């Protein structure tokens, strides 16, 4: 379950998630699973999908995860007034813009990379598409 | 050769005729006898040898017993006594296990005067080469 091993500050402003994505090409493996929509992937989510894809290819090929949480989310629990300080960090998410390569894979036949990427997408809160490596 | 009419195959070896433990009740129930696996069974079993597994026809209609001309033994049956282990697999594809060569089983299957496919006898030669490889041996061919 990904999350920073350490950080300069405990909590982050909410911020906005405008813009288009930055790591947009399959740049390590032969196949990628790409964000088509905008959202937040959570550690649990990033991990659930990973598990899905990893088991699909049994112990074969290789997998990169192009995204990493690093955004701490707080929540206030039941029975609590507004105010009285920012709440407690409960989990981490990765801000996602359209275009992000999320996972890449390699060392397996295309169809299998497709099967595996499919299965993983089903665990994700944002639409995705299969991409392939390109020259240039 | 015509269609369907009585035929099976479930035995142990030519040197154990008619037995009960390996088989028993399932060797005569449809125009076939648990007692008559010797009069036509041994119509040429003893003559030659008792040490090679062989199943055979049944050809029945409704005629008391049955008329079944016999024929040949398999080819993994001739890897226990003539080309290696009495087991076979071991760990079939873990390491090479056991091994054979091209001189071996060439004649122990070039015998077949009642089976095999392809006029060329250099071919149905190599047809019995694999029956020493479904166990995972080595090729000294």
């Amino acid at each position: 379950m990904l999350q920073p091993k350490r950080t300069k500050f405990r909590k982050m402003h909410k911020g906005r998630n405008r813009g288009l994505a930055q790591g947009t090409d399959v740049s390590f493996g032969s196949f990628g699973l790409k964000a088509v929509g905008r959202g937040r992937l959570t550690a649990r989510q990033i991990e659930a999908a990973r598990r899905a894809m990893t088991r699909a290819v049994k112990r074969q090929g290789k997998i990169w995860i192009r995204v990493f949480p690093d955004k701490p989310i707080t929540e206030k629990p039941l029975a609590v007034r507004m105010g009285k300080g920012k709440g407690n960090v409960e989990y981490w998410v990765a801000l996602i813009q359209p275009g992000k390569v999320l996972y890449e894979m390699d060392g397996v036949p295309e169809e299998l990379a497709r099967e595996a990427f499919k299965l993983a997408a089903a665990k994700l809160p944002i639409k995705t598409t299969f991409v392939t490596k390109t020259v240039m | 050769a015509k269609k369907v009419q009585a035929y099976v195959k479930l035995q142990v070896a030519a040197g154990m005729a008619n037995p009960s433990p390996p088989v028993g009740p399932a060797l005569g129930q449809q125009g076939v006898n648990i007692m008559e696996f010797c009069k036509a069974f041994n119509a040429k079993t003893d003559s030659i040898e008792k040490g090679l597994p062989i199943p055979v026809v049944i050809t029945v209609y409704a005629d008391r017993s049955f008329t079944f001309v016999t024929k040949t033994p398999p080819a993994a049956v001739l890897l226990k006594k003539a080309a290696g282990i009495k087991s076979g697999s071991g760990k079939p594809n873990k390491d090479k296990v056991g091994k054979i060569s091209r001189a071996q089983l060439q004649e122990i299957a070039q015998t077949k005067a009642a089976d095999m496919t392809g006029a060329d006898i250099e071919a149905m030669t190599r047809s019995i080469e694999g029956t020493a490889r479904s166990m995972g041996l080595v090729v000294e061919d």
Partner: protein
């Protein structure tokens, strides 16, 4: 062997280039050599289908603008962030 047809662009800038892609055309550019660069408009489907083939990025291709022929090589391409599309190509006069 790869032959790409192309008008020169009467306009430039975000506005003009977005208008471009809205009409299933897309902008590109040619530079290198001693001549000024040439701002180009390409048909989408045509070029798109072409660059599906690996040799497109290795071979010299020939760009026909106004009956004149320029020989180039693919230099860089901007692709759509998640659509199978082309936003812009850089061609080198070679």
């Amino acid at each position: 062997m790869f032959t790409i047809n192309a008008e020169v662009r009467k306009e430039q800038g975000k506005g003009a280039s977005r208008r471009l892609r809205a009409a299933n055309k897309f902008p590109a550019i040619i530079y290198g050599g001693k001549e000024a660069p040439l701002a180009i408009e390409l048909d989408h489907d045509k070029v798109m289908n072409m660059q599906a083939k690996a040799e497109f990025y290795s071979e010299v291709l020939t760009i026909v603008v106004d009956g004149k022929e320029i020989k180039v090589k693919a230099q860089d391409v901007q692709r759509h962030p998640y659509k199978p599309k082309l936003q812009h190509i850089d061609f080198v006069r070679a």
